[PDB]
Amino acid sequence: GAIIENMSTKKLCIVGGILLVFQIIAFLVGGLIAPGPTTAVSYMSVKCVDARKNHHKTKWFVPWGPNHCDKIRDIEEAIPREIEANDIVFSVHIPLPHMEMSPWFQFMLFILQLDIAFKLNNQIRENAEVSMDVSLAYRDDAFAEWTEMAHERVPRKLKCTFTSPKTPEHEGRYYECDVLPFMEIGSVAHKFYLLNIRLPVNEKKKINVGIGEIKDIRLVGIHQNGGFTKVWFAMKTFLTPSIFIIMVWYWRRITMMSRPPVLLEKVIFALGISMTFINIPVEWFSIGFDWTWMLLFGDIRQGIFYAMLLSFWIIFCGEHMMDQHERNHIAGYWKQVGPIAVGSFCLFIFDMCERGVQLTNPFYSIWTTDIGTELAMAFIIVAGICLCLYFLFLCFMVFQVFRNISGKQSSLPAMSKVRRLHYEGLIFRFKFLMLITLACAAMTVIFFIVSQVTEGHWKWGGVTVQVNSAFFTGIYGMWNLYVFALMFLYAPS
Amino acid sequence: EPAVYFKEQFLDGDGWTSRWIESKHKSDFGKFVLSSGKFYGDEEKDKGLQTSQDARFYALSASFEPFSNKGQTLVVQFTVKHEQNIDCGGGYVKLFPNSLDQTDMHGDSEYNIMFGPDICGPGTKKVHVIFNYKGKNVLINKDIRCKDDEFTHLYTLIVRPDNTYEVKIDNSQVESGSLEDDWDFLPPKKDNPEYSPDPSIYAYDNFGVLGLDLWQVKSGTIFDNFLITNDEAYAEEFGNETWGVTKAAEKQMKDKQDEEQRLKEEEEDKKRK
Amino acid sequence: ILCASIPGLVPKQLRFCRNYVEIMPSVAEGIKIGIQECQHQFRGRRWNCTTVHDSLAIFGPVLDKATRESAFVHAIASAGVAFAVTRSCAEGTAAICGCSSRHQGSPGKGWKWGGCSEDIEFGGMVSREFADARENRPDARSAMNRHNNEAGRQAIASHMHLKCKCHGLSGSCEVKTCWWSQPDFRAIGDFLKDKYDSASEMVVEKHRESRGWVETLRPRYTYFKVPTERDLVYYEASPNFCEPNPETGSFGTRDRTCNVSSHGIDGCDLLCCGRGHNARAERRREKCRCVFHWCCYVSCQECTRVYDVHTCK
Numbered sequence A: 001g002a003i004i005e006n007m008s009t010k011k012l013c014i015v016g017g018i019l020l021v022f023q024i025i026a027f028l029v030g031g032l033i034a035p036g037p038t039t040a041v042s043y044m045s046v047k048c049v050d051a052r053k054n055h056h057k058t059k060w061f062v063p064w065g066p067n068h069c070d071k072i073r074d075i076e077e078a079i080p081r082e083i084e085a086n087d088i089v090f091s092v093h094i095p096l097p098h099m100e101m102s103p104w105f106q107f108m109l110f111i112l113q114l115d116i117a118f119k120l121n122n123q124i125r126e127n128a129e130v131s132m133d134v135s136l137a138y139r140d141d142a143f144a145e146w147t148e149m150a151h152e153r154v155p156r157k158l159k160c161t162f163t164s165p166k167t168p169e170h171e172g173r174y175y176e177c178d179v180l181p182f183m184e185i186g187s188v189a190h191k192f193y194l195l196n197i198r199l200p201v202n203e204k205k206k207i208n209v210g211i212g213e214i215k216d217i218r219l220v221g222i223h224q225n226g227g228f229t230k231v232w233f234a235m236k237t238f239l240t241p242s243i244f245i246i247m248v249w250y251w252r253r254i255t256m257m258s259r260p261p262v263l264l265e266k267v268i269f270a271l272g273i274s275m276t277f278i279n280i281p282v283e284w285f286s287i288g289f290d291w292t293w294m295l296l297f298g299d300i301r302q303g304i305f306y307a308m309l310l311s312f313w314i315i316f317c318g319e320h321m322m323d324q325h326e327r328n329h330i331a332g333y334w335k336q337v338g339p340i341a342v343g344s345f346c347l348f349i350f351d352m353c354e355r356g357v358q359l360t361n362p363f364y365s366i367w368t369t370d371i372g373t374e375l376a377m378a379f380i381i382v383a384g385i386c387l388c389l390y391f392l393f394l395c396f397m398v399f400q401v402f403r404n405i406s407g408k409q410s411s412l413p414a415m416s417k418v419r420r421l422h423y424e425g426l427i428f429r430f431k432f433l434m435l436i437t438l439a440c441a442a443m444t445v446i447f448f449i450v451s452q453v454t455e456g457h458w459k460w461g462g463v464t465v466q467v468n469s470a471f472f473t474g475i476y477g478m479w480n481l482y483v484f485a486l487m488f489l490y491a492p493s
Numbered sequence B: 001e002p003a004v005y006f007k008e009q010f011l012d013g014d015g016w017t018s019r020w021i022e023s024k025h026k027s028d029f030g031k032f033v034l035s036s037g038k039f040y041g042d043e044e045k046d047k048g049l050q051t052s053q054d055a056r057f058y059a060l061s062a063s064f065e066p067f068s069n070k071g072q073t074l075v076v077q078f079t080v081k082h083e084q085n086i087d088c089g090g091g092y093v094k095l096f097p098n099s100l101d102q103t104d105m106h107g108d109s110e111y112n113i114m115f116g117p118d119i120c121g122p123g124t125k126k127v128h129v130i131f132n133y134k135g136k137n138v139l140i141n142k143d144i145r146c147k148d149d150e151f152t153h154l155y156t157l158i159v160r161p162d163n164t165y166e167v168k169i170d171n172s173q174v175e176s177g178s179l180e181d182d183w184d185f186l187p188p189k190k191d192n193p194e195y196s197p198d199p200s201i202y203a204y205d206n207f208g209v210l211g212l213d214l215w216q217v218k219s220g221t222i223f224d225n226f227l228i229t230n231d232e233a234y235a236e237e238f239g240n241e242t243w244g245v246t247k248a249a250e251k252q253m254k255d256k257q258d259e260e261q262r263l264k265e266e267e268e269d270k271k272r273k
Numbered sequence C: 001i002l003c004a005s006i007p008g009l010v011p012k013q014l015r016f017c018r019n020y021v022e023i024m025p026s027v028a029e030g031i032k033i034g035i036q037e038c039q040h041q042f043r044g045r046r047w048n049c050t051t052v053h054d055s056l057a058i059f060g061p062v063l064d065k066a067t068r069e070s071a072f073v074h075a076i077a078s079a080g081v082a083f084a085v086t087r088s089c090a091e092g093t094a095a096i097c098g099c100s101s102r103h104q105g106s107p108g109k110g111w112k113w114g115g116c117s118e119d120i121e122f123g124g125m126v127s128r129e130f131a132d133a134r135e136n137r138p139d140a141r142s143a144m145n146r147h148n149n150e151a152g153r154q155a156i157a158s159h160m161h162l163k164c165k166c167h168g169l170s171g172s173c174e175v176k177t178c179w180w181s182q183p184d185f186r187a188i189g190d191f192l193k194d195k196y197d198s199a200s201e202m203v204v205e206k207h208r209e210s211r212g213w214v215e216t217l218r219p220r221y222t223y224f225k226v227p228t229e230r231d232l233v234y235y236e237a238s239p240n241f242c243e244p245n246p247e248t249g250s251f252g253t254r255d256r257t258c259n260v261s262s263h264g265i266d267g268c269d270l271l272c273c274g275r276g277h278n279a280r281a282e283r284r285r286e287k288c289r290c291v292f293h294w295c296c297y298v299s300c301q302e303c304t305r306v307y308d309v310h311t312c313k
């Protein structure tokens, strides 16, 4: 049987100890060294005023520094200057003053929120939509001209409600508008970004008519924190050689046999390839080049591991049915692998329709229109149904195989010595993996729920320990060590 | 000749039960009652349509013979007594075509025309009028003040094919003017290239329903003595015969009730101390 | 101009002005927005944050008294300074506030390594280092001033809503990001108005650790309870606002107007301090029947409408 069937309890114990030491180190690295996953800076947009010269000639408005725009503090100041819509531009400068953005901030999110003011004569219409004429540009040094990156209409729906009674006693109070998503970029590659938002209005077309009275536009810039990416890459540059060593060792130990590998060994190796796909730090090329597709590639690279591991569990449970099958061909697993394959492909199509489309329009988001919303929700629902169906199949398989194990165990003394060792080792080998996998899955879910409710920090003694970053690094270390132990312990003798 | 498009005085006492259809759009609608009120001039000629529940939406309507005012003068008349002296509540009428399913109507139903005093809050006390036109609901430019007290008062509206109108209250004119000069139907003349006149402003294709759908906080007010016709003189003489006959009797009777109240209050103040 | 025209600053405030010179316009904006809210919240209550152009005391002697009105003024001014400084940091006009470090090679908790988290503290920091500086002298007035100022700052600190956005595997919430969102300053106005209606009176006490006297305030714990850093406090009874009296700093209601018809927002029969509740009716001229864009200068037609002037004696 496999090497775990031959390993004495002492050597298995020392292996477990080494694995746990590496586990705790992988938790600490994110806990103490890493600076936490994401920043969230909040900019107030500065209401520049167009000089009316720009009929067709295009120029960019800057909130501060040299050549700052003609500026308005309170939007009411437009009225006695006789300033009108189509002339007020909500300009935003992305790195706050005396700062820079560096490619280590592997992405940018931006989401809007509007300070719409209630007024009895200008309430929001029931299905109002904002039609921003957004344009964005980048620059690389504090004196070069801005060069355009994007210029696109960005319609959005106003989900806004008013909590105070609709009485003239409460005019001027803001609506509680939700955070409408705005833009995502898969890689920062330039030092400064300038962003202009305009709200042109036309009564006949009803573009931006009846959206209420907007006092200010608030824009929140989210990015992966600069030190966390360096910690992540320092971890990946350690895991890559280790997994390559384990892969070459496993491949040699598989090929160097009289018999060809069984299906379990093939799927173990495939899981290894999928994970060494994740470990290879090809993200470390993104700090030099301007590759916008990095986020989509990362998402597909992670999905290929999930859809491989979920299939590995089923293949493992199937390959331990003790009797009446003993077949090795993959085609017998259609009923079980089909659900996860279909779910994975469907969720991949959804992720394409959002993230890959965003490559041509950074402001796109599928949740804007009802057709897109319904299609994306159909894909997500099909994925969820496939996942639940798969999980039911997995629970049924585990129940059936424990049925087989109990039945066979009621007859172990009867057959020969070597066959008795074979079957008892099969029982132990299966139980070991299921206990380890239950421990890892339960621990991952527990630390995931903790990362959802925690503040993001924990004060211990004189130091602060990151919880969110420790979670990411710890779970990544957990499943990497899980794959390592799986490869080592389940190779042939 | 005076065409009686609609008319009612509840002289039968029970004709309301057949002529009016209440809306069942919402289950919590207030229910009207027929009564002459706490003070009146006539026992039966003043027994009108009364609101009875506080803080309710109301929706009552009655159908009438279909007609069109194209090439004809339009007249509407009704009388109201504000028994409770509302601090907020509607006191207006709506007219509808025959397409209105009276079982389902509500405040958002599409009417042809709106007319009546509107009293909600002491800050605004102006008579409310709204005419539908080519998908637009348009309201008056100039203002007309409504009456204050609980006494029974008469209201009347008049529209002419010459695109002119006039408002009659208590059988007396209160306002007159031209439709396109007092409503924002058409774009302003200034020569603006989009401008072109439309004589069809004063008329609608058809009418078949008179409706009373409204909100009130204080109930108690009563509505009576309705008329829809083409003849201004018929409306004037009907208003005289239906309101001038009661004016003096109701005045005297509520005056004597107020005097009785003053006697009772002053003698209670004398006895209490 | 810096730290020269402004007359009333105490030496800590001069040093703060000389160091954080760029912040001072934002502090003036915060004072202005706070005073606007204190005018709005009391536009009926017999006293409506009336300003006087004397420039030595822009409200007159009345707010020097340790009364609930001065309590509200101090609380809303502190909240306004905090809000305006936070907004100005958000606009990016202020280069001083928060983290301002350009580059960090080794782990150094700067921008390029740790991001920025210290920004959200700046409004409270500047408001407390500015407003509380003049209230160091240990009088009962100053103790009340400090408590009310902290109450104003905690009002802003309490109403910051937490909002979250998430991203990850395929847009799922495995990576979640959250930030604090500023509250609308009208909401803080209503909240401080509610606190003003529920302000607690509490009495003065005197003692010192050394040979001398130092003052502190003692709550009226017989019925009510005052939570620290949350509720406004005062120790001087508010004067009657009916008659004009420059000695106490109160201006009469001889020119004020109210909802005379059938009621009064705080009692028209009371706040008018007399009889005669109507003075004129005016044909006000105003824009009407407008197209109403979302912003400004609708350039619409105009008309005149009659309004009743219930100015009362």
Ligand SMILES: *[C@@H]1O[C@H](CO)[C@@H](O[C@@H]2O[C@H](CO)[C@@H](O[C@@H]3O[C@H](CO)[C@@H](O)[C@H](O[C@H]4O[C@H](CO)[C@@H](O)[C@H](O)[C@@H]4O[C@H]4O[C@H](CO)[C@@H](O)[C@H](O)[C@@H]4O[C@H]4O[C@H](CO)[C@@H](O)[C@H](O[C@H]5O[C@H](CO)[C@@H](O)[C@H](O)[C@H]5O)[C@@H]4O)[C@@H]3O)[C@H](O)[C@H]2NC(C)=O)[C@H](O)[C@H]1NC(C)=O
Binding pocket: A166, A167, B057, B088, B089, B090, B091, B106, B107, B108, B114, B118, B119, B120, B121, B122, B123, B124, B130, B137, B213, B214, B215, B216, B217, C259, C263, C264, C265
């Ligand atoms: C001075 O003194 C006092 C107190 O000190 C204050 O005066 C009032 O105080 C009270 C207390 O809050 C308030 O008045 C009323 O409060 C009640 C609370 O429930 C409400 O009943 C009432 O609500 C009306 O107005 C609100 C405005 O938000 C509406 O939401 C509500 O639906 C009520 O409006 C209906 O009723 C009005 C009168 O009946 C109609 O004029 C109005 O159009 C609306 O009617 C609808 O329904 C009918 C039939 O169902 C339809 O025909 C209507 O359609 C028409 O209008 C629509 C829309 O324009 C068009 O689409 C359509 O074409 C038309 O046909 C409607 O669909 C009050 O809130 C209030 O505070 C004060 N009253 C006021 C200001 O009027 C005062 O505040 C104090 N202070 C001061 C003055 O400063």
